[PDB]
Symmetry: C5
Subunit: 268 residues, 5 copies
C-alpha cells in the first residue's frame, strides 16, 4: 500500500489498526476540544461588559480565536471518524481511504489566525515601558508566521523523510525561541507599575504560555519521543498526540483568555 | 464476532438486535436530550438581566454547560442511529460496524466541562462562612476530574473485564462521596445569613443534587443491576440506561440552573 | 416483510409505495413546519421589549417552544426523506430500511417540552381569581405528562395491535379533557378585571386552543377515521396526518404565542 | 422510465441529461440565492434601530421572510445536487433516483410564509386613507393563500397533464390580479400626505413589486414559453427557470425590504 | 473520459491525480478561508459601536460580505473533498465523478454580492468633492456586474476552448480597468480635506485594493502563466490558484474592512 507524504496515524491505521479504546478516545478528546471552544466563545462575548472599554479588544480577539478553534477541531473530529472504519473479523479500526488520509495540517494553517491574535491581544491589557507596540506586534506576527509555515512543511515528511522532518522542525524552533524571548520582555514591562495582584496573574500567564506553547512541538515529535520502533510509534502515540494537542489548545487559548480577562478586571 | 473493550449496547445489538420500540425510544430520548439543552441555553441567556450583576456569572456558567450538553447529546444521537441498521428479514436493528461501535465515553469526557462548572457556579450565588472559596473550588475540581477519568477507564471494560469495571467504579465512588461531603458544607454555609425563602430553595437544590448525581453511577451499573443474564442485560437495559442519563442530564443541569436562578432572584 | 410495532406510514411505504405527489407533499409540509418555527423564534426574541417586564417570560417560553419545535420538525423532515426511496421501474417511493423505519414518536417526547411550557406561559399574562397559581400549574404538568406518555405507548401499536392503540388513546383522552377543563377556568378568571379588548383576545385564544389541540388526537386516529380498509388507510391518510400535525403545530405554538403577545401589549402601560 | 406527476427538470435529466455548464450554473444560482437571504437577515436585524419604533415591525417581518427564504433555498440547493449525478461515459449529469426527484413545490409551500408577510409589512410603513387596515390584510392573506395552493397543485402536472397545469394556473392568476389591484390602492393611499421623496420611493416599490411578482408565473410557464418541443423545453429552460426564480426572490424580498426601510427612514 | 466545459483541476485529477500534499494543502487553505470569514463576521459586529452612527454602515456591509464569503468558501471546501478520492494502489487522489466535477464558478456568482458591497461601503466613510455619490455607485455596480458575468462565462472554457477563455477574460479586464479608474478618483477626492492620519490609511487602502483585486485575474490565468504544458499546468498550479484566491479573499474583504473601520475611527 502506497501512502506517500502522510502523517504516521495513517501508517498505524493501515498496518496494526486501532483498538476500540484508541479509536473512541481520539474521537472523544477531539469532540471535547471543539465543545470547549464554542463554550469559550459564549463566555468571552457574555463577559465583554465586565471590563473597561480599553480592555474589551482582548475579549473580542479571544472570541475570534474561539471561532477559528471551534471550526477546525469540529472539521478534524469528522476527519478522524471518516478515515478509520471497523473491521468485524479482527475487531479493530483500519485506514478507510474513501474518507481521505488523516492530516494534522488542518491545525497548522488555522494557527495563522490563533498565534498572531493570541500574541497581539496581551498588548491591549499590559502597558509597555521600553518596547514599542508596533515593533513587538511585527516581531510576533513575522516569527509566528515563519514558525507555523516551516512546521507545516515538516509534518508532511514525519514518516516519508525523517531528515526533512527534523530540519524544518529545527528552523521552526528558532522562530519559537524568538517569540518566547519577546513575550518574556512584554511580561516584565507589563509587571512594572501595576498592583501586586496584577503581577501575580502576569506570572501565572507566563508559566501557562511557556508550558502550553511547548506542548505543540511535543505533539510534532510525539511518534519518535521513544525513538524508532518505540512504545509511542503505535496507537498509544496517536492517542498521546491528540490528547497533548487538546490540553495545549484549551490552555493556550481558553485559560490564557480567561487569565487576561481577570487581569483586565484588576486593572479596571 | 470480535468487539473487544466495547459497551454492552454493541453486544445486545450484535446478538439479539433491537426491536422497533427499543431502537426508536433510545433515538427519541437522546433527541429530547439535546433539544432541552438548546432550549435551556436560550432561557439562561434571555434571563441574564433578571438578577443583580454579581449573580449573572451563574446564568453564564449555565449557558456554558448547555453548549457542552447540546453538542455532546447531538453527536451521541447521531452515533446511535448510525451504529444500528434495520434487518428486513427479522425486523430488528443490528450492529452496523461501518457506523462505528456505540460508546457512552463521549458523555464522560464532556463531564470535564459540566461537573467543574456545575460545582463552581453555586459559589457565585451563596456566601461561604468558615470555608475558603478557593479551597472549596480546588476540592470540587480535583475530585470532579478524578471521579470522571476513573469512571471513563472503567466503562470500556463493562463487558470485556467485569473486575476492572467494578474496581475503577469503586475508586470513582470515593471521589463522588468527597464531592457530596463538600457540597453539603457549601449548602449549610449558604443557608447562614439568607431569608427562609432562600433556605427553602437551597434545601430543594441539595435533594435535586443528591438524587440527580446518583443516577449517573446507576446508569454505569444498569446492565448488571439484575445480576449477570438478568432482565436488564437486554434491550430493556439499553433503553433504561439512556432514559436514566436523560433524566439525570435535565435534572443536574437545566433544573439545577433554574433553581439557582430563582435563588439569585430571591437574594437580589 | 416483518416490521413489528411500526407506524402505518411504513406499511403503506412497504406495500403500495408513495406517488411523487404524496412523497413530495409530506416532504414540503414538514419543511414548511420547521421553517415556521425558526421564523417564530426570531419574531418572539425581536418583540421581547414590546411588553412590560412582567409579561416578557411569555415571549421567552414561546422562544423555548420554537427551539424544541424547530429541532424536532427538522429531524422528522430528514427522517421522512431517508426512509422512502424512488423505484425507477414502477415510479413510486418504497420503504428503504437502511434509513430506519419512520416513527411519529419523535413529536410525542418533544411534547414533554411544548405542552408544559404552552400551558405554563398563559399564567404569566392572565391573573387568576378563585384558582391557585401552583395548583393550576401542577394539574397542567401532571395531566400533560400522563396524556403524552400514554399516547406515546399507544402509537407504537397503531397497526400491530388495534386494541392497545385504542385503550392507551382512551386513557390519554381522559387527561386531555382534564386539561381542557382547567384551561377553561384559567380563561374565565383571566377575563375578570381586564378591558373588553383583552377579553376578546382571550375568547379567540380559547377557540384556537380548543380546535388546534383537538387536531393531535385527530392525527392519532387518522388512518382509521374511514374504518380499517378505508380511503384514509393509504398514502392519502399519510399526507392528511402530516398536514394536520403541521396545521396543529403552527396554530398551537406560533399563533397562540402571537395572541398571548398581543394580550400582553393590551395589558401593558 | 416511469416518473409520473414530476417537474420537467427530471424528464430532461432522465433523457438528454445536463451539460457541466447547465448543472453547475443551476447549483451556483441556487447557492447565491440562500447566501443573499442570510446576508439580508443580518442587514435587517443590524438596521432595526435606524427607524422610529412604529416602523421596526417592517425590519422584523423582513427578517422573518429571510429565515424562510434561507432555509428553503438551502434545502432546494442540496436537492438539486443530490438528484443529478455525472455519467463519465458521455460527460453529462443524469437523474439519480436515490436522491429523490427534483420538485419546485418546496418554494410554493414556503410562499405561505413569504407572500402574507411581504404584503402585511407595507401596512406598517404607509398610512391608509379610505381603506380599512383589517380589510386590506384579510384580502391579501385570503387571495395570497388561494394563489399559492392552486399553483402548487398545477405545477405537479406541468408534464403529466398540460390541461390541469394551465387550468390551475389560470385560477391562480385570478387571485394574483386581485392582489395587484389591492396593492395599487395601498400604494396610492400611501402616497397621500407624505413628502415627494417618500412618494418617489413608493413609485419605485410599485414597479419592483409588479415586475418581480410577475416573474413567478413566468417561471411556472418557462418550459412552454417557446411552445411544445421549443428551445426552452431543454436544459436551457431548466437554467432559465431557476435564474428567473433567483432574480424574483432577491427583488421581491431583499430589495423590496431595503426600499421599505428607506421609506421608513424618510418618514422618521 | 469526457469532461467537456470543466475547470482544469478536473483534468489534472482525472489524468495525473493529486499527491497527499497537493490534496491536503488545497483542503487546508479553503478551510482557513471560511474560518477567517466567520471570525471577521464576529469582529465587524462586535466593533460596530466603536465608530460614529454615520460610519456604522461600513461595519454592516463588511458583515454582509463575511456571510457571503463564509457560506461560499464552506461550500467550495466540501466540493473539493467530495470531488477527489484516494486510490490506495497508486497513493494519489483521482477525480470521483459521483461527487460532481469541481468548479470555481461558485466564487464568481457570490462576487455579485462581494464586489458591489466592497465598492459601495467606501462611499459611507469618504466624502466625494467633484464626483456625485449616485454616479460613482452606478458605475461601480454596472462595471462590477459585467466584469463578473463575462469572467464567469470565460472560466467554463479554460480547457475546452482557450480562445473563448481569453476573449471573455479580455472583455472582463476592460470593466476591471474602469473600476480601478473610478476607485482612484474616489481615493483622491477622499484624501482632500482630512487629517494626515486619514490620508495615510487611504493610501494603504489604495495599494491593498490594487494588489488584492489584481490577484483574481492572476488566479484566472494561473494554469497558463508558464504557457501550455508548463510547470503550472499540474497539481502545483491547482495549489497556486486556491492559495492566490485565499490571499486575495482575506486581503480584499477582511483586511480592507479593518482599514475602512480604522479610517472611520480617525474621522469620528
Ligand atoms: C449550534 C447552536 C450553538 C449556539 C451558540 C453560539 C454562540 C454565539 C453567540 C450567541 C449568543 C450571544 C448573544 C449576546 C448576549 C446578549 C446579552 C444580554 O442579553 O444581556
Ligand atoms: C438553531 C439556532 C437557535 C438557537 C439560538 C442560540 C442563541 C442565540 C442568541 C440569542 C440571544 C438574543 C439576545 C437578545 C436579547 C434582547 O433582544 O433583549
Ligand atoms: C447577527 C447578530 C445580531 C446581533 C446584534 C448586535 C448589535 C450590537 O451589538 O449593537
Ligand atoms: C456555529 C458557530 C457560531 C458562531 C457564529 C457567530 C456569528 C455572529 C455572532 C454575533 C453575536 C454578537 C452578539 C452581540 C453582543 C453585544 C454585547 O453583548 O456587547
Ligand atoms: C477542560 C475544562 C475547560 C472548561 C472551560 C469552558 C469554558 C470556559 C469558561 C470558564 C470561566 C470560569 C470563570 C472564572 C473567572 C471568574 C473568577
Ligand atoms: C499573518 C499574520 C498577520 C495577520 C494580521 C492581519 C490583520 C491585521 C490588520 C492590519 C493591522 C491594523 C492595525
Ligand atoms: C423534560 C422536561 C422539560 C424541561 C423544560 C425544557 C427547558 C425549559 C427551560 C426552563 C424553563 C422553565 C421556566 C422557569 C420559570 C420559573 C420562574
Ligand atoms: C486543596 C485541594 C486539593 C485536593 C485535596 C483532595 C482531598 C482528598 C480527597 C480524596 C478522597 C479519596
Ligand atoms: C480539570 C477541570 C478544571 C477546570 C478548569 C477551569 C479553567 C478556568 C481557570 C480560571 C481560574 C481563575 C479564576 C479564579 C476563580
Ligand atoms: C483530559 C485528560 C483525560 C485523560 C484520560 C486518559 C485515559 C486513557 C484512556 C484509556 C487508556 C487505556 C489503554
Ligand atoms: C403559515 C403561517 C405563517 C406564519 C408566519 C411565521 C411567523 C411570523 C410571526 C407572526 C408575525 C405577525 C405578527 C404581527 C401582529 C402584531
Ligand atoms: C415532565 C413534567 C414537567 C416538568 C417540567 C418543568 C421543568 C422546570 C421546573 C421549574 C421549577 C421552578 C418553578 C418555581
Ligand atoms: C414500552 C414503551 C417505553 C416506555 C417509555 C416511558 C416514557 C418515559 C419518558 C419520561
Ligand atoms: C444580487 C446582489 C444583491 C445584494 C445582496 C446583499 C443583501 C444585503 C442588503 C444590502 C443592501 C444595502 C443597501 C443600503 C442602502 C442605504 C441605507
Ligand atoms: C441560521 C441562522 C438563523 C438565525 C436564528 C435566530 C437566532 C437568534 C438571533 C436573534 C438576534 C437578536 C438581536 C436583537 C438586537 C437587535 C439590535 C441590533
Ligand atoms: C394562511 C396564511 C395567512 C396566515 C397569517 C399568519 C398568522 C399570524 C397572524 C395572527 C395575528 C393576528 C393579528
Ligand atoms: C395544501 C393542500 C394541497 C395538497 C394536495 C395535493 C394534490 C393532491 C392530488 C392527489
Ligand atoms: C491569515 C490572516 C488572519 C487574520 C484575520 C483574523 C480574523 C479577522 C479579525 C480581525 C483582527 C483585527 C485586529 C485589530 C486591529 C487593531 C485596530 C485598533 C483599534 C483601536
Ligand atoms: C437604494 C439601494 C437599493 C439597492 C439594493 C441592493 C442591490 C445591489 C445591486 C448590485 C448589482 C448587481 C447586478
Ligand atoms: Na469511523
Ligand atoms: Na439506523
Ligand atoms: Na428519499
Ligand atoms: Na450531483
Ligand atoms: Na476526498
Amino acid at each position: 500500500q502506497e501512502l506517500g507524504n502522510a502523517n504516521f496515524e495513517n501508517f498505524i491505521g493501515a498496518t496494526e489498526g486501532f483498538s476500540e479504546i484508541a479509536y473512541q478516545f481520539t474521537s472523544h478528546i477531539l469532540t471535547l476540544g471543539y465543545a470547549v471552544m464554542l463554550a469559550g466563545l459564549l463566555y468571552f462575548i457574555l463577559t465583554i461588559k465586565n471590563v473597561d472599554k480599553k480592555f474589551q479588544m482582548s475579549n473580542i480577539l479571544s472570541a475570534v480565536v474561539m471561532v477559528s478553534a471551534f471550526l477546525l477541531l469540529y472539521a478534524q473530529a469528522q476527519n478522524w471518524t471518516s478515515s478509520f472504519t471497523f473491521n468485524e473479523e479482527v475487531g479493530r479500526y483500519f485506514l478507510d481511504p474513501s474518507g481521505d488520509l488523516f492530516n494534522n495540517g488542518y491545525r497548522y494553517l488555522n494557527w495563522l489566525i490563533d498565534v498572531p491574535m493570541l500574541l497581539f491581544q496581551i498588548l491591549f491589557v499590559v502597558s509597555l515601558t521600553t518596547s514599542k507596540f508596533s515593533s513587538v506586534r511585527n516581531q510576533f506576527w513575522f516569527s509566528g508566521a515563519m514558525m507555523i509555515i516551516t512546521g507545516y512543511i515538516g509534518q508532511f515528511y514525519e514518516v516519508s523523510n525523517l531528515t526533512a522532518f527534523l530540519v524544518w522542525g529545527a528552523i521552526s524552533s528558532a522562530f519559537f525561541f524568538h517569540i518566547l524571548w519577546v513575550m518574556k520582555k512584554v511580561i516584565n514591562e507589563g509587571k512594572e507599575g501595576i498592583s501586586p495582584a496584577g503581577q501575580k496573574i502576569l506570572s501565572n500567564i507566563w508559566i501557562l504560555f511557556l508550558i502550553s506553547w511547548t506542548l505543540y512541538p511535543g505533539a510534532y515529535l510525539m511518534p519518535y519521543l521513544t525513538g524508532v520502533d518505540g512504545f509511542l510509534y503505535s496507537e498509544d502515540g496517536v492517542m498521546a498526540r491528540q490528547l497533548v494537542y487538546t490540553i495545549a489548545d484549551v490552555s493556550s487559548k481558553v485559560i490564557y483568555g480567561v487569565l487576561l480577562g481577570n487581569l483586565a478586571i484588576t486593572l479596571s
